[PDB]
Amino acid sequence: LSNQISGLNVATRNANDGISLAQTAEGALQQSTNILQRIRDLALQSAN
Amino acid sequence: LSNQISGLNVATRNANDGISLAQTAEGALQQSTNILQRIRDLALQSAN
Protein backbone atom coordinates (compact mmCIF):
# COMPACT_ATOMS: atom_id res chain seq x y z
CA LEU A 1 0.00 0.00 0.00
CA SER A 2 2.87 2.41 0.68
CA ASN A 3 4.34 1.69 -2.75
CA GLN A 4 0.92 2.22 -4.31
CA ILE A 5 0.23 5.53 -2.56
CA SER A 6 3.71 6.84 -3.37
CA GLY A 7 3.10 5.94 -7.01
CA LEU A 8 -0.22 7.77 -6.93
CA ASN A 9 1.37 10.90 -5.44
CA VAL A 10 4.15 11.00 -8.03
CA ALA A 11 1.58 10.28 -10.75
CA THR A 12 -0.64 13.15 -9.61
CA ARG A 13 2.43 15.39 -9.65
CA ASN A 14 3.34 14.30 -13.18
CA ALA A 15 -0.29 14.93 -14.14
CA ASN A 16 -0.02 18.44 -12.71
CA ASP A 17 3.04 19.07 -14.89
CA GLY A 18 1.06 17.65 -17.81
CA ILE A 19 -1.95 19.90 -17.28
CA SER A 20 0.34 22.91 -16.96
CA LEU A 21 2.04 21.99 -20.24
CA ALA A 22 -1.37 21.53 -21.86
CA GLN A 23 -2.57 24.92 -20.58
CA THR A 24 0.54 26.57 -22.03
CA ALA A 25 -0.18 24.85 -25.35
CA GLU A 26 -3.82 25.98 -25.13
CA GLY A 27 -2.76 29.58 -24.58
CA ALA A 28 -0.41 29.46 -27.55
CA LEU A 29 -3.27 27.98 -29.58
CA GLN A 30 -5.58 30.82 -28.49
CA GLN A 31 -2.94 33.28 -29.68
CA SER A 32 -2.82 31.48 -33.03
CA THR A 33 -6.62 31.76 -33.25
CA ASN A 34 -6.40 35.51 -32.62
CA ILE A 35 -3.74 35.76 -35.33
CA LEU A 36 -5.99 33.84 -37.73
CA GLN A 37 -8.89 36.19 -36.99
CA ARG A 38 -6.62 39.15 -37.72
CA ILE A 39 -5.54 37.41 -40.93
CA ARG A 40 -9.13 36.92 -42.08
CA ASP A 41 -9.88 40.56 -41.27
CA LEU A 42 -6.88 41.84 -43.22
CA ALA A 43 -7.69 39.47 -46.09
CA LEU A 44 -11.30 40.63 -46.40
CA GLN A 45 -9.89 44.15 -46.25
CA SER A 46 -7.55 43.06 -49.06
CA ALA A 47 -10.65 42.71 -51.24
CA ASN A 48 -10.55 46.54 -51.43
CA LEU B 1 -19.15 33.72 -34.74
CA SER B 2 -16.22 36.05 -34.04
CA ASN B 3 -14.82 35.49 -37.53
CA GLN B 4 -18.28 36.14 -38.97
CA ILE B 5 -18.67 39.37 -36.98
CA SER B 6 -15.26 40.65 -38.07
CA GLY B 7 -15.96 39.76 -41.69
CA LEU B 8 -19.27 41.60 -41.55
CA ASN B 9 -17.62 44.72 -40.09
CA VAL B 10 -14.94 44.82 -42.78
CA ALA B 11 -17.62 44.12 -45.40
CA THR B 12 -19.68 47.08 -44.18
CA ARG B 13 -16.54 49.21 -44.40
CA ASN B 14 -15.95 48.08 -47.99
CA ALA B 15 -19.62 48.86 -48.61
CA ASN B 16 -19.23 52.44 -47.38
CA ASP B 17 -16.12 52.79 -49.55
CA GLY B 18 -18.09 51.59 -52.57
CA ILE B 19 -21.00 53.90 -51.78
CA SER B 20 -18.59 56.84 -51.66
CA LEU B 21 -16.99 55.79 -54.96
CA ALA B 22 -20.40 55.50 -56.62
CA GLN B 23 -21.41 58.88 -55.18
CA THR B 24 -18.34 60.52 -56.73
CA ALA B 25 -19.13 58.84 -60.05
CA GLU B 26 -22.72 60.07 -59.68
CA GLY B 27 -21.53 63.64 -59.19
CA ALA B 28 -19.35 63.36 -62.28
CA LEU B 29 -22.33 62.00 -64.24
CA GLN B 30 -24.48 64.92 -63.07
CA GLN B 31 -21.81 67.34 -64.26
CA SER B 32 -21.61 65.57 -67.62
CA THR B 33 -25.37 65.68 -68.17
CA ASN B 34 -25.40 69.37 -67.21
CA ILE B 35 -22.69 69.91 -69.83
CA LEU B 36 -24.81 68.03 -72.38
CA GLN B 37 -27.76 70.26 -71.44
CA ARG B 38 -25.64 73.34 -72.15
CA ILE B 39 -24.46 71.69 -75.38
CA ARG B 40 -28.04 71.31 -76.60
CA ASP B 41 -28.70 74.95 -75.69
CA LEU B 42 -25.67 76.06 -77.71
CA ALA B 43 -26.66 73.82 -80.62
CA LEU B 44 -30.23 75.11 -80.78
CA GLN B 45 -29.13 78.74 -80.44
CA SER B 46 -26.70 77.84 -83.23
CA ALA B 47 -29.76 77.57 -85.48
CA ASN B 48 -29.22 81.35 -85.77
Curated annotation (Swiss-Prot), chains A, B:
Localization, UniProt: Secreted; Bacterial flagellum
Post-translational modification note: Phosphorylated on tyrosine residue(s).
Family classification: Belongs to the bacterial flagellin family.
Function: Flagellin is the subunit protein which polymerizes to form the filaments of bacterial flagella.
Protein name per Swiss-Prot or TrEMBL: B-type flagellin
Gene assigned in the entry: fliC
Shown stretch of the complete protein: 54 to 101 of 488
